[PDB]
Amino acid sequence: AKALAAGASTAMLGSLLAGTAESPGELIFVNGKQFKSYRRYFQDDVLSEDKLVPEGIEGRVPFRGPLGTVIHQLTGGLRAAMGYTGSATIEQLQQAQFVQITAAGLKE
Amino acid sequence: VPVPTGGDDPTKVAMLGLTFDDVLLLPAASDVVPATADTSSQLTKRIRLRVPLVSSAMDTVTESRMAIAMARAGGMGVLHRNLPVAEQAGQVETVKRSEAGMVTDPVTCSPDNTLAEVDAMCARFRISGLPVVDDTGELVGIITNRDMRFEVDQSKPVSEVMTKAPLITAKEGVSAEAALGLLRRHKIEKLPIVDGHGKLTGLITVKDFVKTEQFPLSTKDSDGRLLVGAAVGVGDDAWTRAMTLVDAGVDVLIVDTAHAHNRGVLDMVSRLKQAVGERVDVVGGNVATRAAAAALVEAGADAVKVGVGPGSICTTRVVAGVGAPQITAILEAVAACKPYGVPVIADGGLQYSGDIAKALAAGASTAMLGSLLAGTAESPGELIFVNGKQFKSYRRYFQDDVLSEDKLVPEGIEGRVPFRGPLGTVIHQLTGGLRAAMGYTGSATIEQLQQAQFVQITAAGLKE
Amino acid sequence: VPVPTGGDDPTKVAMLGLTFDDVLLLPAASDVVPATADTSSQLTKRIRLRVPLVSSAMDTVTESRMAIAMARAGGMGVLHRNLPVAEQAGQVETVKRSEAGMVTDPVTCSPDNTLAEVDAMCARFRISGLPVVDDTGELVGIITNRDMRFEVDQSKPVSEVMTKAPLITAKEGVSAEAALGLLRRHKIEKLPIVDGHGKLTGLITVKDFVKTEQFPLSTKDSDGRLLVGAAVGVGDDAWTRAMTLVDAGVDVLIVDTAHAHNRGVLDMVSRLKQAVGERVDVVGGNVATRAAAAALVEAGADAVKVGVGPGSICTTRVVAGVGAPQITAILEAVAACKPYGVPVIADGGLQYSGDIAKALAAGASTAMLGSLLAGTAESPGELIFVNGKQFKSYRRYFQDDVLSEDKLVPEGIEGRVPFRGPLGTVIHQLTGGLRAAMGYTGSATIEQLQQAQFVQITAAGLKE
Amino acid sequence: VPVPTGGDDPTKVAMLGLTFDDVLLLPAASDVVPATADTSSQLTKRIRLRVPLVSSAMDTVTESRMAIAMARAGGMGVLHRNLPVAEQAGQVETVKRSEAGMVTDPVTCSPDNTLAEVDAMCARFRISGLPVVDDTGELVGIITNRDMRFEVDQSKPVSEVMTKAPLITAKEGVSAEAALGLLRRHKIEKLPIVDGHGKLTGLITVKDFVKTEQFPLSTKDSDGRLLVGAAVGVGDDAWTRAMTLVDAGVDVLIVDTAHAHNRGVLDMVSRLKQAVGERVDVVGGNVATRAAAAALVEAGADAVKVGVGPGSICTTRVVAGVGAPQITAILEAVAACKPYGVPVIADGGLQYSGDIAKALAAGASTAMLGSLLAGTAESPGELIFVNGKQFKSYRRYFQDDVLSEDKLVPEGIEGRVPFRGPLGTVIHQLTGGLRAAMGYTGSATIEQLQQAQFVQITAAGLKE
Ligand SMILES: Nc1nc2c(ncn2[C@@H]2O[C@H](COP(=O)(O)OP(=O)(O)OP(=O)(O)O)[C@@H](O)[C@H]2O)c(=O)[nH]1
Ligand SMILES: Nc1nc2c(ncn2[C@@H]2O[C@H](COP(=O)(O)OP(=O)(O)OP(=O)(O)O)[C@@H](O)[C@H]2O)c(=O)[nH]1
Ligand SMILES: Nc1nc2c(ncn2[C@@H]2O[C@H](COP(=O)(O)OP(=O)(O)OP(=O)(O)O)[C@@H](O)[C@H]2O)c(=O)[nH]1
Ligand SMILES: Nc1ncnc2c1ncn2[C@@H]1O[C@H](COP(=O)(O)OP(=O)(O)OP(=O)(O)O)[C@@H](O)[C@H]1O
Ligand SMILES: Nc1ncnc2c1ncn2[C@@H]1O[C@H](COP(=O)(O)OP(=O)(O)OP(=O)(O)O)[C@@H](O)[C@H]1O
Ligand SMILES: Nc1ncnc2c1ncn2[C@@H]1O[C@H](COP(=O)(O)OP(=O)(O)OP(=O)(O)O)[C@@H](O)[C@H]1O
Ligand SMILES: [Mg+2]
Ligand SMILES: [Mg+2]
Ligand SMILES: [Mg+2]
Ligand SMILES: [Mg+2]
Ligand SMILES: [Mg+2]
Ligand SMILES: [Mg+2]
């Protein structure tokens, strides 16, 4: 909402979508949870520890679920901002004003 | 040519917002002793509180019990609206009936009644004694709990138990001094009041005088009844709710929205002021700018409540990106409201009594508290005992196993809130803080405190 | 003379209890390939599972969806009883109607019905197509979702939209191979089955063949329907519940209490075995000693569930001071039960698949899972998205404010349970662990795994 | 009658397993100086090491470089098998060619070869100098990197650069003392060796003498070449791999499985012992019980490797529930192996040098190291510099943006391993710890250390 109000027309998302079902990667199950990983021939031992864990356990990204739910949450936030600022369109949102806050305003 | 923060528009970044942590009150020349400071302040244009505090209209903060306690402590409570119209109006009725100079419509019984019937009525209305009338309406006795305490047959009629006429009575128009003298003389607690023909039209208790002596700061109307407010929304359901609340005897209506700079909110305020404005005060919901407060004043609000995402990491700021630091918001709203004599209510972002002093010094007349009161004894919720401590919980039929683990732990064990104790102690601490601020600034009254100056502090002043 | 731990009685401290962390399985001579190990096991004296796992009778674990998924995966589910009798029987009926060799009671409509009516019936039973019958009971056609997908007018009668007779049908006693040949030749998905006079008496669908191919480990009765269990308490309401569940077609009844070494529970087990034993297996509730297991065997139980406060800091141990370490409890219960051929179900205290392998090696035939299944997709609760993650929650009318913070966050955000994904993945991981244990111990079957030996480890063996 | 831990079988819980933290070595009467202690021990029945340590057959531990460093340090390396047969045989050959009493297959060139050609040959075999022979097969000179250093034309033939014959050479059978005398007289580093007809049959360098004097503990064969081991699995591909590794000149084959108590593994050991047992020692895979070790001994193994889930929270214990504490496993394996003179290798769970001492005192003859050696310079992987420290990592074409953030940071940043520096220092620390233990127990040799006594300690002994 702030980026659009500053005058941008769209936003490019990136890390907010890296763990979704539609993003590239492989879905794995580790320690009671779902993860995404960006992951053998000569390991013929049937009782070795590598057969007891999924491949790609290291460097795994958490799983976020369907993309539509993420997009719906983001759009709900944007619509709430548009309601607060009286912006019927994105072009009207681009005319909204800011208030600058201090360091105390970010202190929990 | 460019703005230092970017762009060509010098109003794009409208202002720098100050919050409570950005400022401190400066000491000034003072002859004020904290114990003698006057903390009374205007809630609305027609209502003045002894203690400049109001409890929030949240379903974890204010119901009848909290409203009664807040009114007795010198402030007022606003009942929440997350419940059916009938229940909210019933809570208003409970608050109004809690004490009075004279019960104008006492709960009467009939000689044919069983002891169970009168006992049910007493437990319903939370009272002790009932006058009795015949099927015509003539007073023929009174039954109190000392009579039933000594009667073991639960199924007896009232005529067997009631103290028969003639009772110790008094006529309509009797002065409070005369009624007190009669009660003192005859060593009784209750006094029927009758007209010239002997028809019952009132009841005076000594407990009312005792309460008046015990709670000298109480917020009351002309009849000696506690004041109370209630929240309403916008719409047709909201209009019917407002009318029902006005019927129940509400004193303040608060049109309660997250964003009051809206045509529907302003029209609702105007309609309420046209319809019930000669009896009830109407308060306009939350604003954060000078223009919105001016719109509320134009619409006819009796007070303006301030605050839109005033917390630092609040949900509104994180999700919508919308907010306003509370000190600047109060300064702007006061700039709009003070020329017309409309008080400002500071709502949200208050963590300590110092914050209350700062809010009043910025120009607000009262403060709405909220989370500070959430866990007290008078707030809604059930008290439970877990792991050596007390908590408040907002919490079976088919689970009949006598030895199952669920029977070993209290219900509501999850999501419980710490127990804070009685509300009076919290209010006392907050008032002590405010009086110390008034002593430091030399403010004999709240209106003088509203003229105090701030010093702005840097980041290094907040580092422990 | 004195006992080294105090007093004179050597039986005061009866024994030393071992939990799962105290032991490990020893490697043994093995010609067993984990992929080729046989994990089938006896649930009761008469029921054998392909996967020796059962979901727990908890309201956060097992309802219809969980029971269906567990039965397809090669195990079984036990429906919880924290709900009215009618709903529990409805869930039993839901599980039993999931799939079959032939639908012996198909949902039929009438030609005078509207498209909305048949749509609502289909949604009620989660089906796609209905045969249609007249006011006598002769089959006049069939209507499927390809018919209604291509008809817009929802007020059209079925007779206008339906596919009219003659239909591709077959007579009673048609083999599955012949019925499938018919379904394949005519390129249709459904096939009514009628009696010698043309009256509809069954329905065969290709989806049942597809499900049979897709879930080859399914736990099914002679008619091809998924097996399911249900829990009951003790008492007269429990007896009515049990009779209703037996009428609904349940396969296993579990008398489910915290302390089964009680005369009432034993009497309930005996009564159930006498009344409905020839149809339904009766499993007896939780024990932790040899004597209690022997008492349940004496009462006629078809299986014995083991575990009473098996967790380390479980509520029973802290509040009542009562418990029994699970390995020792299983060993004692098996010593009571194995001579009589009664299987033992290990219930409680399982954190990893290694614990499952240990529990079966101690003598148990199956394991009840519980918390391992709490957050799966098939468990009860709603899926929500919070802070970039998925959670499962167990979550307004008067909150009509569109901009309020309660609109900005999902419902149920307090005390949410982490989401785990589909049940099949969890079951597959657990079975991989069990197969690894069987390979290490050289156990070709679960019955051979029940003969494995342990090594007891010191506390130093638990230090990371 | 009942077993104190449950049930009726006194052998269900077979034993109590001790890990390294469960025991300490007791001091004994000693005339042993740690510096004069003798740490030599039998790896197999035919191979004796100066330092009783062997590097694990893991792809992050042992390749050619680690094997060379281990053999030079007094131990040995076992090449991992997670790679093609040709690469593993090439690594064997690289280890066997590192040094020798006499190079028996010298890398020769021809006068027609350009300088770039012979330079490429030197880079391929990591050498410095090449004899040169003509198309008939007669030695016509020698070209060394000093000759190539002073040449600016890279297209020149070898005949224009090489030192031409006659050369400083010697006949077959010349002793090392005479060869060193010749290399000292003529102040050269290389000496060709010809037969009775002037045909080149060897090459003696002075770097070999330098290496012998610099690494006086090197584990070497009768030809002065370093010893090396390699791991194989079970099956037909494993048999082909083993034959290829034997052709490359490997000294020990390790049949390397997670569970050697298996008919396939024992058959593989017997087949290898029959086929190549006269030349190569065969080591049998991991066991943890006395019966498994006895089976390996009967199968003909030259050594027995011990350890099956020896770590506290290892994946085998958590996922399969299978394990064996390592001290007890070593004691059982030694009870099986010692009467037949079969050495026991301790593999797994070692964290410090004190554990190495404990394992050798329990009866093992050598220890396999593994993760202690993973981050060393000779271990596989690439050295990177991140955040002011060094790391080892196991790490583009289409990212051609010169200013991208991926250019600013090294490849392999994620999942990196701490850098430990040279292997010699780590081995020196471990050997110092072992020598201290030998001094404390009065053990002049490893065989005397194998008779030392333990004290078992409690959990209070492990509290910091
Ligand atoms: N009895 C009575 N009290 C009412 C009624 N409506 C409000 N009240 C208030 O209820 C309060 C308590 O009255 P009672 O319970 O009768 O008190 P009491 O018996 O006079 O006094 P204590 O014995 O000292 O508690 C008083 O403050 C009344 O003003 C009513 O209809 N009847
Ligand atoms: N149609 C139908 N199916 C039933 C009924 N009772 C249970 N079922 C089951 O419901 C499942 C799905 O049946 P339908 O919805 O008709 O599916 P379908 O059109 O045959 O098959 P697909 O197009 O492959 O989904 C089958 O496995 C039936 O055994 C019933 O009364 N009618
Ligand atoms: N040149 C050569 N060296 C070999 C061969 N096979 C093994 N080596 C060994 O490679 C090592 C290095 O020898 P060179 O590269 O010739 O070294 P150098 O020039 O004699 O010695 P420095 O100048 O002191 O390094 C010696 O220890 C040889 O034993 C081979 O075919 N040719
Ligand atoms: N106005 C009255 N005239 C005469 N008798 C009365 C009157 N009011 C109450 N009484 C009677 O006098 C007695 C005292 O009752 P009172 O109402 O004073 O106390 P109570 O509230 O019942 O007692 P307690 O506060 O101790 O519980 C009772 O028997 C009651 O019936
Ligand atoms: N036994 C039958 N004999 C003749 N026609 C039939 C029979 N059963 C269904 N049909 C007709 O065959 C067509 C396809 O129906 P079917 O039930 O096979 O598919 P559907 O479930 O509607 O389709 P989809 O699964 O693709 O959504 C419809 O027109 C239906 O009326
Ligand atoms: N056996 C030999 N007979 C005659 N000349 C030789 C012989 N061996 C080496 N040379 C020559 O002696 C010179 C020195 O070579 P040498 O092999 O001793 O050192 P290098 O390894 O080339 O040099 P450095 O190690 O100092 O870099 C070269 O010109 C080489 O051709
Ligand atoms: Mg009283
Ligand atoms: Mg009293
Ligand atoms: Mg269909
Ligand atoms: Mg289909
Ligand atoms: Mg050289
Ligand atoms: Mg040199």
Element (H, E) at C91: helix C85-96
Does any ligand 5 atom lie closer than 6 A to the CB of residue C254? no
Which tokens sit at C274? Answer: 């006498």
Round to whole Å and give the CA distance between C431 and C441.
15
Round to whole Å and give the CA distance between D438 and D445.
8
Which residues are registered as beta bridge partners of D246? none
Round to whole Å and give the CA distance between D396 and A8.
32
Q: Prior bond to D34 cis, omega within 30?
A: no
- Strands D53-55, D76-79: pairing is parallel
Which one-letter amino acid corresponds to residue D47? I
Between chains, do C396 and B82 touch, taking CB under 8 Å as contact? yes
**Active-site residue flag, A64:** no
DSSP E strands in chain A: the ranges are 26-30, 33-37, 61-62, 98-101
Q: What is the DSSP letter of D74?
A: T
Does any ligand 2 atom lie closer than 6 A to the CB of residue C190? yes
Q: Ligand 3: which residue has its CA nearest to atom 3? A: D127
Site to probe by mutation for ligand 2, drawn from C96, C207, C209, C220 as the one with most ligand atoms within 8 Å of Cβ, is: C207
Residue D212 phi/psi, 5° resolution? -60, -40
Element (H, E) at C420: none
Task: Answer yes or no: is A37 a known binding residue.
Answer: no
Round to whole Å and give the CA distance between C293 and C306.
8
The experimental method is cryo-EM
Nearest to C229 by CA among C39, C84, C47: C47
Residue partners of A49: CB distance under 8 A and separation at least 6: D258, D314, D315, D316
Which tokens sit at B90? Answer: 């019933």
How many CA within 13 A on the CB side of residue B42?
17
Which one-letter amino acid corresponds to residue D410? P
Please tell me which of the candidates C235, C258, C401 has its beta carbon nearest to residue B258: C401
Round to whole Å and give the CA distance between B266 and C450.
77
Q: How far is the CA of B146 from the centre of ligand 7 (A)?
A: 7
Please tell me which of the candidates C402, C420, C436 has its beta carbon nearest to residue A52: C436
Starting at the earlier edge strand, list the strands of the sheet with B130-133.
Answer: B130-133, B139-143, B163-164
Round to whole Å and give the CA distance between B144 and B162.
8
Element (H, E) at B117: helix B115-125
8 Å CB contact between B404 and C322: no
8 Å CB contact between B64 and B94: yes
Round to whole Å and give the CA distance between C24 and D289.
13
For chain B, the helix, strand and coil percentages under 3-state DSSP, each to the nearest 5: 35, 20, 45
Identify the three-state secondary structure at position C289.
coil
Binding residues of C for K(+): 309, 311, 314, 464
Round to whole Å and give the CA distance between B150 and B146.
7
Round to whole Å and give the CA distance between C345 and C368.
7
Q: How far is the CA of B142 from the centre of ligand 1 (A)?
A: 13
CA of A1: which chain B residue's CA is closest?
Answer: B321
User: Which residues of chain B are within 8 Å of residue A107 when distances are taken between CB atoms?
Assistant: 21, 312, 462
Task: Answer yes or no: is B146 a known binding residue.
Answer: yes
Taking the CA of residue B167 as reference, the ligand 4 atom at the shortest distance is: 3
Nearest to B441 by CA among B458, B455, B459: B455
Between chains, do C27 and D328 touch, taking CB under 8 Å as contact? no
Per the listing, tokens 């007070």 go with B303
Nearest to A53 by CA among D316, C437, C375: D316
8 Å CB contact between C286 and C306: yes
Task: Answer yes or no: is B426 a known binding residue.
Answer: no
Interface residues of B toward A, Cβ cutoff 8 Å, are 5, 7, 11-19, 21-22, 259, 261, 308, 312-313, 316, 319-325, 328, 459, 462
Between chains, do D7 and C459 touch, taking CB under 8 Å as contact? no
Does any ligand 4 atom lie closer than 6 A to the CB of residue B163? yes
What are the DSSP calls for D144-201, one per residue? Answer: EHHHHHT---TT-BGGGTSEESS-S-EETT--HHHHHHHHHHTT-SEEEEE-TTS-EE
Nearest to D189 by CA among D174, D217, D208: D208
Give the minimum alpha-carbon distance from A57 to chain B in angstroms, rounded to a whole number. 33
* B112: number of Cβ within 10 Å: 12
Task: Answer yes or no: is A39 a known binding residue.
Answer: yes
A/D interface, count of CB pairs below 8 Å: 31
What's the farthest any 2 CA atoms get from each other in chain B? 96
Residue B447, burial from CB neighbour count under 10 angstroms (0-12, 13-18, 19+): middle
**Active-site residue flag, B314:** yes
Round to whole Å and give the CA distance between B361 and B25.
8
Q: Ligand 6: which residue has its CA nearest to atom 1? A: D168
Round to whole Å and give the CA distance between C419 and B354.
43
8 Å CB contact between D200 and D192: yes
Which residues are registered as beta bridge partners of D303? D283
Give exposure, D435-452, as e/b (b: 16+ Cβ within 10 Å).
bebbbbbebbebebbbeb
Does any ligand 5 atom lie closer than 6 A to the CB of residue C147? yes
Please tell me which of the candidates B7, B17, B261 has its beta carbon nearest to residue A105: B17
User: Which residues of chain C are within 8 Å of residue A69 when distances are taken between CB atoms?
Assistant: 385
Between chains, do A44 and D233 touch, taking CB under 8 Å as contact? yes
**The dihedral formed by the CA atoms of B60, B62, B68 and B73, expressed in degrees to the nearest 10:** 90
Does any ligand 4 atom lie closer than 6 A to the CB of residue B144? yes
For chain C, the helix, strand and coil percentages under 3-state DSSP, each to the nearest 5: 35, 20, 45
Residue partners of C71: CB distance under 8 A and separation at least 6: C77, C95, C218, C219, C220, C226, C227, C228
Taking the CA of residue D145 as reference, the ligand 3 atom at the shortest distance is: 19
Element (H, E) at B132: strand B130-133
Residue partners of C460: CB distance under 8 A and separation at least 6: D19, D21, D22, D312, D459, D462
Identify the three-state secondary structure at position B359.
helix
Which tokens sit at C113? Answer: 């019905």
Residue A96 phi/psi, 5° resolution? -80, 160
Which residues are registered as beta bridge partners of B49? B41
Between chains, do D16 and C332 touch, taking CB under 8 Å as contact? no
Per the listing, tokens 């009168």 go with B118
Round to whole Å and give the CA distance between C431 and D320.
10
Which tokens sit at D305? Answer: 């490797």
**CA C297, chain centre distance (Å):** 23
What are the DSSP calls for B25-48, one per residue? Answer: EPP------GGG----EESSSS-E
Q: What is the DSSP letter of D46?
A: S
Q: Ligand 1: which residue has its CA nearest to atom 9? A: B99
8 Å CB contact between B241 and B81: yes
With the C-alpha atoms ordered D237, D242, D245, D246, is the resulting torsion angle positive or negative? negative
Round to whole Å and give the CA distance between C132 and C106.
10
Residue partners of B285: CB distance under 8 A and separation at least 6: B254, B255, B256, B257, B258, B259, B260, B265, B305
Does any ligand 3 atom lie closer than 6 A to the CB of residue D129? yes
Nearest to D54 by CA among D284, D225, D227: D227
With the C-alpha atoms ordered D183, D186, D187, D192, is the resulting torsion angle positive or negative? negative
* B430: number of Cβ within 10 Å: 23
Resolution limit in angstroms?
2.3
Nearest to C436 by CA among D235, D264, D316: D316
Residue D180, burial from CB neighbour count under 10 angstroms (0-12, 13-18, 19+): middle
Does any ligand 4 atom lie closer than 6 A to the CB of residue B190? yes
Interface residues of D toward A, Cβ cutoff 8 Å, are 81-84, 233-235, 237-238, 257-259, 314-316, 319-320, 414-415
Residue partners of D314: CB distance under 8 A and separation at least 6: A49, D323
8 Å CB contact between D317 and D309: yes
Which residues are registered as beta bridge partners of C48? C42
Nearest to C165 by CA among C140, C186, C145: C140
Taking the CA of residue B144 as reference, the ligand 4 atom at the shortest distance is: 22
What's the farthest any 2 CA atoms get from each other in chain C? 95
Identify the nearest ligand to the CA of D129 by its number: 3
Between chains, do A76 and C408 touch, taking CB under 8 Å as contact? yes
Does any ligand 1 atom lie closer than 6 A to the CB of residue B100? yes
Between chains, do B408 and C319 touch, taking CB under 8 Å as contact? yes
* CA-only gyration radius of chain A, Å: 22
As residues whose CB is below 5 A from the ion ligand 9, the structure lists C 128
Residue C292 phi/psi, 5° resolution? -65, -40
Q: What is the DSSP letter of C36?
A: G
A/C interface, count of CB pairs below 8 Å: 57
